[PDB]
Amino acid sequence: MLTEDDKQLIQHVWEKVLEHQEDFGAEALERMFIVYPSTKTYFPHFDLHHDSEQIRHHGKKVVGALGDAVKHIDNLSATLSELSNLHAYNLRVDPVNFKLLSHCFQVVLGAHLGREYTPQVQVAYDKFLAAVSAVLAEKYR
């Protein structure tokens, strides 16, 4: 389970993310699209060129939802209920893809944090991102 120490490590890193929600979100999305091109088929309506308005606007929305999750870590299901119905019932997102985006997010974090993205920090975010992923896919179970 997420410990208090995990939460603190998460918050310390997150307040930085919040200062550039758009930049981080877009970078995580673009790494996913470039590294795992199959994920692009979920966004046919999007102009997927580097830094497109759609990607930037969406990146901020993703970061925004993750920020809300950080704020309500003990009440994820309820907090993401609307998003869970969306990704499962409407978008039919393959669970595997949540892991791909979570991973790309960690890469963005690692790149921006340098030596501050310690193993302890990675653990906390891994736990966090895995919990968020589980909720966004619970409608399949």
Partner: protein
């Protein structure tokens, strides 16, 4: 297969890699983030905590050897399958490591490289390196 550009993203970044540091990092992170992997290292001594793992000499030395092995893929990008055949038998028949863990170590290495080379580890670079660890994971699962 590998495009000249991909090969460049791999060889140029690797020439700057501190194998011992990145190797120890990747292995310590594997044992810490996915604790069940500790099952395979009962002889390495104390692994009772994240700090214990990061200060475990054997864990660090081993990661060095693992990343050195990855180096053999970087140095012969077209014969990865043949290069790891021996290690494949070792991890399967002898160690019985589920293949899924090969993918997890690969992912960890990707993240470590990102924390060490933020400027050079662009999305395109990540794509080339992800292709690399995946190929090693595939060859080992053989």
């Amino acid at each position: 297969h590998w495009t000249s550009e991909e090969k460049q993203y791999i060889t140029s970044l690797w020439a700057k890699v501190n194998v011992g540091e990145v190797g120890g990092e990747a292995l310590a992170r594997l044992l810490i983030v996915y604790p069940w992997t500790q099952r395979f290292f009962a002889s390495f001594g104390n692994l009772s905590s994240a700090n214990a793992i990061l200060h475990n000499a054997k864990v660090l030395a081993h990661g060095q050897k693992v990343l050195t092995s990855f180096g053999e893929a970087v140095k012969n990008l077209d014969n990865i399958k043949k290069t790891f055949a021996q290690l494949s038998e070792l991890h399967c028949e002898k160690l019985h490591v589920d293949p899924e863990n090969f993918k997890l170590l690969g992912n960890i290495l990707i993240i470590v490289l990102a924390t060490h080379f933020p400027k050079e580890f662009t999305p395109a670079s990540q794509a080339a390196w992800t292709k690399l660890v995946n190929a090693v994971a595939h060859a080992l699962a053989l």
